[PDB]
Amino acid sequence: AGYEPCWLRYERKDQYSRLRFEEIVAKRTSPIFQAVVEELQKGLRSMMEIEPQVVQEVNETANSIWLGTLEDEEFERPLEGTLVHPEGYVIRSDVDDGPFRIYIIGKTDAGVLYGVFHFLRLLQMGENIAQLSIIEQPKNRLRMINHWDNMDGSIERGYAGRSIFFVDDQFVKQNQRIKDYARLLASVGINAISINNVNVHKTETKLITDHFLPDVAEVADIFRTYGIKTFLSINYASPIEIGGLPTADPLDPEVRRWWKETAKRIYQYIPDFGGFVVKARPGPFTYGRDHAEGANMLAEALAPFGGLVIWRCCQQDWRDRTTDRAKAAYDHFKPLDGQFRENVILQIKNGPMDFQVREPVSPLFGAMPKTNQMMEVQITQEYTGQQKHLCFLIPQWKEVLDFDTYAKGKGSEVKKVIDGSLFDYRYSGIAGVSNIGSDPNWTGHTLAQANLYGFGRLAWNPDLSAEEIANEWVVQTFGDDSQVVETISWMLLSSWRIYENYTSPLGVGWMVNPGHHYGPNVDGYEYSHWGTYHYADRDGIGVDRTVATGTGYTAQYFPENAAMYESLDTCPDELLLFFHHVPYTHRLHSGETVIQHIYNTHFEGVEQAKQLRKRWEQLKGKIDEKRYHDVLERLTIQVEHAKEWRDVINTYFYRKSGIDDQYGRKIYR
Amino acid sequence: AGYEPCWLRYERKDQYSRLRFEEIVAKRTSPIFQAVVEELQKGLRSMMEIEPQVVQEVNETANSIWLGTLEDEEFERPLEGTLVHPEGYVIRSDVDDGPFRIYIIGKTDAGVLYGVFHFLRLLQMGENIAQLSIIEQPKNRLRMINHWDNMDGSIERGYAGRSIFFVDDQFVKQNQRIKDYARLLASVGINAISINNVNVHKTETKLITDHFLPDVAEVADIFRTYGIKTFLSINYASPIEIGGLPTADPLDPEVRRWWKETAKRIYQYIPDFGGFVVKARPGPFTYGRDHAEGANMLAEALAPFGGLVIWRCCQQDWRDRTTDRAKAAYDHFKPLDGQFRENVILQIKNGPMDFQVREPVSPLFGAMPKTNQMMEVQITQEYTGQQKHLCFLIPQWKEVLDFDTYAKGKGSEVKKVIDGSLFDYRYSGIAGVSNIGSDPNWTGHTLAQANLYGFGRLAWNPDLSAEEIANEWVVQTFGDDSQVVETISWMLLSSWRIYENYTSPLGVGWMVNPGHHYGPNVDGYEYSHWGTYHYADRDGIGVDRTVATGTGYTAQYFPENAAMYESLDTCPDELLLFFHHVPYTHRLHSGETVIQHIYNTHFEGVEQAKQLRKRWEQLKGKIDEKRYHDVLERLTIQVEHAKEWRDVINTYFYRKSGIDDQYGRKIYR
């Protein structure tokens, strides 16, 4: 009772929306099967007020829900016969005229778990299940969540409370919330999780030692029952820090042995350990080694056990416009294609910079046919409102996933790159930086729950529309009142564009306060060593990334996209300032001058934020008071901060451009 | 051997610079007298290689140094007869033709302590003491040091290591460094010290309780022997935090009683407790009370014991140019003149903003004839280089001290205001924010030792020239080689102007990175709620603080100075942008346009910094290698950072003004 059930409400149905079932046939007794049966019992009891008896053999005359794998079937029907994916499943209603039977057939126990959550999802959404014929197989092998939780309880870039894993440099004593968290993750198909910050500090470095492994294993045991593999972010300098060795050089014989022994030790506690997430003071480059050498060493240590190495892909001068941070990732990793071991997967952010409200797609996707790749997206809203401002990230992620790289001609969308189909990747997928914390509503902003849900849905099937994902989430979280559904869906679907409207313009990004990264500060990092510049001056703004006159970044894309961005007239408006430096008077495809566009979206974005609040207020009475006010409080905070964003950006550019707002709206001198 | 002796080196003299003394006549046995005798023995042994016998009665045929007060004299000569100040003293060589005798006569034991340090200073400097006739009396009653030390060991705005007082929320075990620190403070006449941060956190709030008072008293005992009174910064909400009371309202009967009891308890441990330093979550205004009501309540609690209350004198909008943070202090306190109790002293910073490289004098000085006032200066270089960049603060402090407020016509300089002579203040003086830390050289930058020394010297006598103070410090710290003395003195004397040259221009201040406040960031706080704006736009820069068209801040000064700043043509260049908003093309008294002035001082300031380094390098061999390299390392760090300051500021203003450098020097686009 300390936290919300999020989208797994299982609200009691009226007398006209019940189902008649007397038994649940559980064909297996595995740990996963016990959790799945429990979940099914929980949902049916809560929603239908029924308590079917769990049995292991079907009763020919009872209405039942059958749970099992192909191997448990008496007759293997054609549909489930086409399943090839281990986590896939089939759900079909028996077509006989006798007892009502629902068959949930999974290729493996994991498949049954996801099938049962799909079945429950159908019930929460009020779907007619009299004649089901469903087949589902996830597109991404890895559907992972990265936690930036520290063991002192803090969470790097965490805006939803303290960690639910650690406290006072120890694991929390009560694991009930970890179980409920596992349930939420599994309901949306998430099958992997790294429980600690990628920036591994002193105490966290010890997670790979006997001192903490027992607690790590207890947590992994919980996730295992929900089909989730556990990973740990590691400190590359561990051999020195805790091993006593004089070096961390991946080529040093003893360092290689140390990691092999460490791997062996971990698997003694966690037989199905997922592997290591790596952000590499000492490191590969510290010894003149490349990423392949550094990643392959860890890969070799985990190989005998089936573990994976997730290798995630800073003192540059603002004075030199020839150097471009956006080009770094590609320039550093592309040349390494083909040198990585099979169990190494390069983790690349959606964009080449750092999770800005809008960034073009990282050129690395589609550029390394011989190297597994998985995309990293940020669920926690570091540069997208920090859960103060509403920002449904699903539409943005779909734009990235559907981006055609043309790597192998038309039809080489990012999603085909990371789902492994385009290049036959053995291991690949997508990862998301957790947006949860100890807050009772899990995500700080009640509506941010939609981003966690949505992440899982896209990870399972990138082809799902933003519209249906929002619909599913709203209906399960707030009910089916058509006004509530339409209003909240509209809020979610338009939120990202609204936030972008009053923040950084036309894809140039940043313009945020340094450090905490919250709020407007146009020149915040403009003269820093982070390579994040907009180069705004009294005549124009933008980064010239063209080959003709700029950094040449455009050439990292394949011909079709390179030419699109390379040209000043074809470059889409939404990314113009990321690719070209232009005069304030330059006219966009929309007809607006760059400067007037800035004023327009900032004034209008605030008005759109006020509308978000107005529409929510009109739902009062149709939502419980607690959550109604929890969200209203944040929408009001959003409106007020949006005003600051608007005025600071408008004033900065009026002071620099000297050009007034076409409509004479209020710009403070 | 863990730290430097700073200016109390007492270097061994050659055979041609010795003194013949067989006895030290100590007329008293007080704790202070034991320390003074010890100091005299230390200096004479170290410098002269002599060990005179300490006696209590003069030996008619022995060469001796006589120590005592008027009361101990056989014959009271006219000079010491004119002494009126308790801390004053006279030093005179006997004019007889028999044994050589030096008489150090203090009005009180404290006077003898300062007289002995003056005598030792004469010896270190190689002065002829055969015919001394000296009389000295300090101008300021309060010559205090404020520590911003936290009990966890950190020091707010501390750039010279960790605190030498606290560690792990406890007092340090070894007090030898506290004793040596007391010696340094006393050598320059400092007679008061607040040992904890003005921002009192949780643990520090307990310093006024039995839990810590024993340790506080042990520290106070040490300072007492060196003529230093101990103060504690307090948490105004203490009645709630540790008292259990439901309020902190200074008018609440119980709150008034709580503080009276707290005072009584402290004096039981520290009979000569100096009092409280106060920076006032709950506070006077929290209950609708004014500063007088809040300060008088604490004053009444300390009154029966002779204690003093040092009352030190944030969400404004950048959009409203009518509101001016510079006017706040004066507007809030002036109206309260005459309502404060006698033992309350208002502590006002040298400037109305926040220790910027250059700020005009706080109008409060000379504006409250009925209220004791003491000026606060910052020795730690928060906005003046953070001991990375050299910055001898003495010249700046003299400009403030010598500023004529004309409060009572010509001759109403700030120094006469704070020394209490102008308004007959019973308690007043000056305070400095400590620049020391656990670093072996005490101040981070070896040469920053000069700022602590210089602070004390000015506190004693504001009339001392920057030149002689530097001379004294250099000679005692580095010897009398004429090249060393001339070179280091030049470095110190020109350092402030050099740093100002490449930082904020013409008195507008700031332009520093937010948070740590180190380094260039022109718009760092430009759109913040701190009221620190320069309003630079594509046409000009500056804050209009005139009465005619601006905030009206100029009217806070008396007529003579108000008119000077009010006028665009008479306003001195060095403060122009603090008082007027002007076009980049405006011509200064120097003939430079405002924009060209910016380029000039920034390019030239870096060249001046390189010269500081070059001149120091030429001293190699004349300074021990340790300190030679300690300083060279910092001068090189200064040169490199100065280049960043230069380029960032020049680029920002070229990008905004569009006006090129007259001399075509390198400005990055």
Side-chain angles (χ1 to χ4, degrees), chain A residues 1-172 174-241 243-280 282-314 316-668, chain B residues 1-172 174-241 243-280 282-314 316-668:
Chain A
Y3 45 78
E4 311 184 339
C6 291
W7 60 87
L8 297 183
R9 297 199 308 164
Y10 300 148
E11 292 289 322
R12 177 55 57 72
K13 301 291 191 173
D14 59 39
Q15 292 297 305
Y16 309 117
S17 314
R18 304 298 178 83
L19 302 174
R20 185 187 180 93
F21 284 122
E22 294 88 62
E23 310 190 326
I24 293 167
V25 187
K27 300 303 296 183
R28 300 183 180 298
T29 63
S30 63
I32 289 180
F33 252 70
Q34 183 165 357
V36 57
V37 169
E38 256 73 308
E39 191 64 31
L40 187 61
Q41 291 180 288
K42 179 181 180 59
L44 294 176
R45 186 185 298 111
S46 190
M47 294 186 276
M48 308 302 170
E49 186 172 41
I50 62 180
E51 295 185 299
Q53 180 169 48
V54 184
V55 304
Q56 62 172 40
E57 180 64 31
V58 65
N59 176 335
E60 34 288 344
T61 61
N63 301 307
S64 60
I65 299 173
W66 191 88
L67 305 174
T69 59
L70 289 292
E71 181 177 58
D72 309 302
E73 291 187 281
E74 184 183 3
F75 296 81
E76 173 176 351
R77 290 283 257 65
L79 191 55
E80 59 258 40
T82 63
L83 287 179
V84 294
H85 195 114
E87 295 170 300
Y89 58 91
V90 159
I91 300 176
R92 54 184 180 69
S93 309
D94 197 316
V95 301
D96 72 299
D97 292 310
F100 180 51
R101 303 190 188 89
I102 291 296
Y103 292 108
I104 302 187
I105 313 161
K107 189 66 173 179
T108 61
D109 290 2
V112 182
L113 171 65
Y114 303 135
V116 170
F117 269 118
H118 184 160
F119 183 68
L120 289 177
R121 180 165 71 253
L122 292 177
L123 268 47
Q124 290 206 95
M125 295 191 80
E127 292 297 298
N128 190 333
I129 62 166
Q131 300 182 118
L132 302 180
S133 181
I134 296 163
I135 184 170
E136 279 288 319
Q137 306 186 87
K139 275 70 178 302
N140 298 296
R141 176 168 187 165
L142 292 176
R143 303 181 301 279
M144 189 163 179
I145 285 297
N146 293 154
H147 270 260
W148 286 1
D149 294 43
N150 290 311
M151 293 182 80
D152 70 348
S154 66
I155 300 177
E156 197 167 331
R157 310 307 178 177
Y159 314 110
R162 308 288 287 184
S163 70
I164 65 169
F165 289 123
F166 317 114
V167 60
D168 305 313
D169 293 308
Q170 293 182 296
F171 282 65
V172 178
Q174 174 62 296
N175 298 317
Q176 183 54 53
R177 187 161 192 178
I178 290 182
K179 176 183 184 176
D180 287 315
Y181 177 45
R183 290 175 53 244
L184 290 168
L185 297 183
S187 69
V188 291
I190 292 173
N191 69 5
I193 183 177
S194 58
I195 66 173
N196 61 304
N197 194 357
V198 292
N199 290 307
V200 183
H201 307 312
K202 201 241 291 186
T203 304
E204 295 86 349
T205 297
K206 301 182 181 178
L207 295 169
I208 54 179
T209 68
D210 292 315
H211 184 281
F212 284 131
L213 279 170
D215 297 315
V216 174
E218 176 181 0
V219 171
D221 288 335
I222 291 177
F223 287 127
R224 179 179 303 105
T225 66
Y226 284 100
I228 298 164
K229 281 200 169 187
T230 304
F231 292 69
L232 282 174
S233 298
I234 62 81
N235 173 355
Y236 207 86
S238 290
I240 299 174
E241 300 297 304
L245 285 62
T247 182
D249 188 347
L251 293 190
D252 177 80
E254 292 184 293
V255 168
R256 301 168 74 73
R257 169 70 182 188
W258 190 85
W259 282 107
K260 289 186 66 69
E261 284 303 296
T262 287
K264 178 175 297 180
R265 179 180 60 267
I266 297 172
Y267 283 83
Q268 276 169 38
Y269 291 83
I270 318 173
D272 61 2
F273 187 62
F276 303 147
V277 171
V278 183
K279 180 184 175 180
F285 291 60
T286 304
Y287 308 103
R289 316 304 181 192
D290 59 47
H291 292 292
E293 294 178 306
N296 287 345
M297 183 278 292
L298 296 176
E300 287 145 10
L302 299 178
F305 307 106
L308 305 172
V309 176
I310 306 296
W311 194 268
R312 291 181 81 243
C313 301
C314 70
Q316 50 202 128
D317 207 326
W318 55 268
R319 303 174 177 69
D320 174 28
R321 299 200 188 191
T322 70
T323 294
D324 190 353
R325 172 180 174 176
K327 299 174 63 174
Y330 179 101
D331 287 336
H332 284 50
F333 291 86
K334 173 203 173 183
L336 294 174
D337 193 40
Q339 308 180 200
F340 293 100
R341 296 270 289 198
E342 55 188 56
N343 62 322
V344 166
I345 306 161
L346 296 185
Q347 180 151 300
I348 303 148
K349 292 187 178 177
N350 48 278
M353 295 296 272
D354 183 25
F355 303 129
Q356 293 307 294
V357 180
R358 180 180 300 277
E359 279 184 34
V361 179
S362 292
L364 275 177
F365 296 120
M368 301 184 71
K370 309 170 182 297
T371 305
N372 299 314
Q373 298 183 319
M374 62 188 299
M375 180 173 71
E376 185 182 327
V377 296
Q378 190 181 50
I379 312 182
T380 180
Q381 301 165 214
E382 178 175 8
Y383 300 105
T384 52
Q386 303 189 1
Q387 282 108 283
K388 244 65 186 294
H389 298 245
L390 176 70
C391 191
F392 185 48
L393 301 163
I394 279 51
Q396 172 184 35
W397 294 335
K398 290 189 59 61
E399 280 183 31
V400 173
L401 293 165
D402 290 357
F403 181 71
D404 196 336
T405 69
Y406 295 85
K408 301 180 71 173
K410 183 180 183 60
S412 299
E413 295 91 333
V414 169
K415 56 189 179 184
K416 298 179 180 177
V417 170
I418 62 177
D419 71 12
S421 67
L422 191 66
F423 299 121
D424 309 298
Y425 289 155
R426 198 198 324 301
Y427 306 107
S428 62
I430 185 174
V433 181
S434 176
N435 70 332
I436 72 156
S438 63
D439 277 19
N441 64 9
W442 297 80
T443 60
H445 196 304
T446 308
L447 303 186
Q449 284 164 15
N451 287 326
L452 178 58
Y453 180 83
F455 172 73
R457 300 299 283 129
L458 290 176
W460 182 274
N461 181 2
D463 289 333
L464 294 166
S465 70
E467 293 60 43
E468 68 185 307
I469 290 174
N471 182 261
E472 297 178 344
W473 183 78
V474 178
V475 172
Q476 299 173 90
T477 304
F478 292 104
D480 63 21
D481 181 290
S482 69
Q483 173 173 55
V484 169
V485 177
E486 194 291 320
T487 294
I488 294 180
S489 295
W490 172 76
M491 292 174 75
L492 295 171
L493 295 172
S494 63
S495 61
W496 175 48
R497 191 59 171 171
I498 286 173
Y499 185 76
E500 172 173 33
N501 280 336
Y502 54 76
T503 52
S504 190
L506 309 164
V508 75
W510 308 89
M511 293 188 187
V512 298
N513 278 304
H516 60 271
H517 300 162
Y518 185 71
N521 198 319
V522 185
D523 278 12
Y525 281 115
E526 189 59 10
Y527 299 86
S528 66
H529 66 188
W530 298 108
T532 55
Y533 321 119
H534 49 62
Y535 296 123
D537 57 31
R538 82 204 307 276
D539 301 315
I541 180 174
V543 183
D544 184 356
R545 294 194 154 96
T546 66
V547 166
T549 56
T551 73
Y553 170 77
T554 177
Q556 301 199 333
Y557 290 99
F558 282 78
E560 292 87 339
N561 292 310
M564 183 181 287
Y565 298 132
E566 176 68 13
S567 171
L568 178 63
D569 88 293
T570 66
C571 186
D573 293 347
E574 70 270 16
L575 292 167
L576 186 61
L577 301 184
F578 186 101
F579 291 101
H580 298 259
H581 181 78
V582 304
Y584 289 121
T585 53
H586 175 77
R587 278 191 193 287
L588 302 170
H589 291 266
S590 68
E592 309 161 293
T593 56
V594 165
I595 181 63
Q596 189 51 50
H597 172 86
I598 292 173
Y599 298 146
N600 284 341
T601 63
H602 288 76
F603 278 114
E604 286 145 48
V606 168
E607 294 311 299
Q608 289 155 14
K610 290 176 184 176
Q611 191 58 43
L612 287 176
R613 183 172 58 177
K614 185 176 178 174
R615 295 295 302 286
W616 180 260
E617 300 183 312
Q618 300 183 308
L619 298 184
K620 183 176 176 64
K622 286 188 170 180
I623 299 178
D624 68 274
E625 287 297 296
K626 177 58 180 301
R627 298 188 298 169
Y628 172 73
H629 291 296
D630 271 358
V631 173
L632 182 58
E633 286 168 37
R634 302 244 168 179
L635 290 170
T636 291
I637 283 178
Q638 176 174 348
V639 169
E640 293 306 294
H641 199 217
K643 289 175 176 175
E644 191 61 27
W645 269 100
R646 175 198 62 198
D647 293 338
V648 174
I649 292 178
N650 288 342
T651 289
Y652 175 104
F653 284 102
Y654 171 71
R655 288 184 182 170
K656 189 160 268 187
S657 80
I659 300 175
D660 301 64
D661 168 43
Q662 174 183 354
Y663 304 97
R665 284 164 300 188
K666 189 63 171 182
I667 293 182
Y668 297 89
Chain B
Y3 45 78
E4 311 184 339
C6 291
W7 60 87
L8 297 183
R9 297 199 308 164
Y10 300 148
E11 292 289 322
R12 177 55 57 72
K13 301 291 191 173
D14 59 39
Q15 292 297 305
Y16 309 117
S17 314
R18 304 298 178 83
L19 302 174
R20 185 187 180 93
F21 284 122
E22 294 88 62
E23 310 190 326
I24 293 167
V25 187
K27 300 303 296 183
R28 300 183 180 298
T29 63
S30 63
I32 289 180
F33 252 70
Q34 183 165 357
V36 57
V37 169
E38 256 73 308
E39 191 64 31
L40 187 61
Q41 291 180 288
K42 179 181 180 59
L44 294 176
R45 186 185 298 111
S46 190
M47 294 186 276
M48 308 302 170
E49 186 172 41
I50 62 180
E51 295 185 299
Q53 180 169 48
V54 184
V55 304
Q56 62 172 40
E57 180 64 31
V58 65
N59 176 335
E60 34 288 344
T61 61
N63 301 307
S64 60
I65 299 173
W66 191 88
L67 305 174
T69 59
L70 289 292
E71 181 177 58
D72 309 302
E73 291 187 281
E74 184 183 3
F75 296 81
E76 173 176 351
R77 290 283 257 65
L79 191 55
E80 59 258 40
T82 63
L83 287 179
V84 294
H85 195 114
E87 295 170 300
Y89 58 91
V90 159
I91 300 176
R92 54 184 180 69
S93 309
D94 197 316
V95 301
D96 72 299
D97 292 310
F100 180 51
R101 303 190 188 89
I102 291 296
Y103 292 108
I104 302 187
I105 313 161
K107 189 66 173 179
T108 61
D109 290 2
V112 182
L113 171 65
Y114 303 135
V116 170
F117 269 118
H118 184 160
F119 183 68
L120 289 177
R121 180 165 71 253
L122 292 177
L123 268 47
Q124 290 206 95
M125 295 191 80
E127 292 297 298
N128 190 333
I129 62 166
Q131 300 182 118
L132 302 180
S133 181
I134 296 163
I135 184 170
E136 279 288 319
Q137 306 186 87
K139 275 70 178 302
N140 298 296
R141 176 168 187 165
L142 292 176
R143 303 181 301 279
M144 189 163 179
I145 285 297
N146 293 154
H147 270 260
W148 286 1
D149 294 43
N150 290 311
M151 293 182 80
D152 70 348
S154 66
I155 300 177
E156 197 167 331
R157 310 307 178 177
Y159 314 110
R162 308 288 287 184
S163 70
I164 65 169
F165 289 123
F166 317 114
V167 60
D168 305 313
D169 293 308
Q170 293 182 296
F171 282 65
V172 178
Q174 174 62 296
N175 298 317
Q176 183 54 53
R177 187 161 192 178
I178 290 182
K179 176 183 184 176
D180 287 315
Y181 177 45
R183 290 175 53 244
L184 290 168
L185 297 183
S187 69
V188 291
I190 292 173
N191 69 5
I193 183 177
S194 58
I195 66 173
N196 61 304
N197 194 357
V198 292
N199 290 307
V200 183
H201 307 312
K202 201 241 291 186
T203 304
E204 295 86 349
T205 297
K206 301 182 181 178
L207 295 169
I208 54 179
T209 68
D210 292 315
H211 184 281
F212 284 131
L213 279 170
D215 297 315
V216 174
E218 176 181 0
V219 171
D221 288 335
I222 291 177
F223 287 127
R224 179 179 303 105
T225 66
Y226 284 100
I228 298 164
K229 281 200 169 187
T230 304
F231 292 69
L232 282 174
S233 298
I234 62 81
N235 173 355
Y236 207 86
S238 290
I240 299 174
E241 300 297 304
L245 285 62
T247 182
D249 188 347
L251 293 190
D252 177 80
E254 292 184 293
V255 168
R256 301 168 74 73
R257 169 70 182 188
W258 190 85
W259 282 107
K260 289 186 66 69
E261 284 303 296
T262 287
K264 178 175 297 180
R265 179 180 60 267
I266 297 172
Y267 283 83
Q268 276 169 38
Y269 291 83
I270 318 173
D272 61 2
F273 187 62
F276 303 147
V277 171
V278 183
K279 180 184 175 180
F285 291 60
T286 304
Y287 308 103
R289 316 304 181 192
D290 59 47
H291 292 292
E293 294 178 306
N296 287 345
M297 183 278 292
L298 296 176
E300 287 145 10
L302 299 178
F305 307 106
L308 305 172
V309 176
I310 306 296
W311 194 268
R312 291 181 81 243
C313 301
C314 70
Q316 50 202 128
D317 207 326
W318 55 268
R319 303 174 177 69
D320 174 28
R321 299 200 188 191
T322 70
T323 294
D324 190 353
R325 172 180 174 176
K327 299 174 63 174
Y330 179 101
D331 287 336
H332 284 50
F333 291 86
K334 173 203 173 183
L336 294 174
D337 193 40
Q339 308 180 200
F340 293 100
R341 296 270 289 198
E342 55 188 56
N343 62 322
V344 166
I345 306 161
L346 296 185
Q347 180 151 300
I348 303 148
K349 292 187 178 177
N350 48 278
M353 295 296 272
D354 183 25
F355 303 129
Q356 293 307 294
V357 180
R358 180 180 300 277
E359 279 184 34
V361 179
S362 292
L364 275 177
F365 296 120
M368 301 184 71
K370 309 170 182 297
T371 305
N372 299 314
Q373 298 183 319
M374 62 188 299
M375 180 173 71
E376 185 182 327
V377 296
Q378 190 181 50
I379 312 182
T380 180
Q381 301 165 214
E382 178 175 8
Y383 300 105
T384 52
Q386 303 189 1
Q387 282 108 283
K388 244 65 186 294
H389 298 245
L390 176 70
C391 191
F392 185 48
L393 301 163
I394 279 51
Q396 172 184 35
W397 294 335
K398 290 189 59 61
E399 280 183 31
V400 173
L401 293 165
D402 290 357
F403 181 71
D404 196 336
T405 69
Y406 295 85
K408 301 180 71 173
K410 183 180 183 60
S412 299
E413 295 91 333
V414 169
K415 56 189 179 184
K416 298 179 180 177
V417 170
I418 62 177
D419 71 12
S421 67
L422 191 66
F423 299 121
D424 309 298
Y425 289 155
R426 198 198 324 301
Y427 306 107
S428 62
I430 185 174
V433 181
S434 176
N435 70 332
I436 72 156
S438 63
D439 277 19
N441 64 9
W442 297 80
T443 60
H445 196 304
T446 308
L447 303 186
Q449 284 164 15
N451 287 326
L452 178 58
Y453 180 83
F455 172 73
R457 300 299 283 129
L458 290 176
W460 182 274
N461 181 2
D463 289 333
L464 294 166
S465 70
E467 293 60 43
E468 68 185 307
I469 290 174
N471 182 261
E472 297 178 344
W473 183 78
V474 178
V475 172
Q476 299 173 90
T477 304
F478 292 104
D480 63 21
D481 181 290
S482 69
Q483 173 173 55
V484 169
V485 177
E486 194 291 320
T487 294
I488 294 180
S489 295
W490 172 76
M491 292 174 75
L492 295 171
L493 295 172
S494 63
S495 61
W496 175 48
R497 191 59 171 171
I498 286 173
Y499 185 76
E500 172 173 33
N501 280 336
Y502 54 76
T503 52
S504 190
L506 309 164
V508 75
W510 308 89
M511 293 188 187
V512 298
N513 278 304
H516 60 271
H517 300 162
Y518 185 71
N521 198 319
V522 185
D523 278 12
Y525 281 115
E526 189 59 10
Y527 299 86
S528 66
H529 66 188
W530 298 108
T532 55
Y533 321 119
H534 49 62
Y535 296 123
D537 57 31
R538 82 204 307 276
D539 301 315
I541 180 174
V543 183
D544 184 356
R545 294 194 154 96
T546 66
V547 166
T549 56
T551 73
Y553 170 77
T554 177
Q556 301 199 333
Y557 290 99
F558 282 78
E560 292 87 339
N561 292 310
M564 183 181 287
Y565 298 132
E566 176 68 13
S567 171
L568 178 63
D569 88 293
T570 66
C571 186
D573 293 347
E574 70 270 16
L575 292 167
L576 186 61
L577 301 184
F578 186 101
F579 291 101
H580 298 259
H581 181 78
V582 304
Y584 289 121
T585 53
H586 175 77
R587 278 191 193 287
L588 302 170
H589 291 266
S590 68
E592 309 161 293
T593 56
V594 165
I595 181 63
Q596 189 51 50
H597 172 86
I598 292 173
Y599 298 146
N600 284 341
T601 63
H602 288 76
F603 278 114
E604 286 145 48
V606 168
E607 294 311 299
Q608 289 155 14
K610 290 176 184 176
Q611 191 58 43
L612 287 176
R613 183 172 58 177
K614 185 176 178 174
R615 295 295 302 286
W616 180 260
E617 300 183 312
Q618 300 183 308
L619 298 184
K620 183 176 176 64
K622 286 188 170 180
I623 299 178
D624 68 274
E625 287 297 296
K626 177 58 180 301
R627 298 188 298 169
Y628 172 73
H629 291 296
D630 271 358
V631 173
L632 182 58
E633 286 168 37
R634 302 244 168 179
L635 290 170
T636 291
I637 283 178
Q638 176 174 348
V639 169
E640 293 306 294
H641 199 217
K643 289 175 176 175
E644 191 61 27
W645 269 100
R646 175 198 62 198
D647 293 338
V648 174
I649 292 178
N650 288 342
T651 289
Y652 175 104
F653 284 102
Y654 171 71
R655 288 184 182 170
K656 189 160 268 187
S657 80
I659 300 175
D660 301 64
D661 168 43
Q662 174 183 354
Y663 304 97
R665 284 164 300 188
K666 189 63 171 182
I667 293 182
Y668 297 89

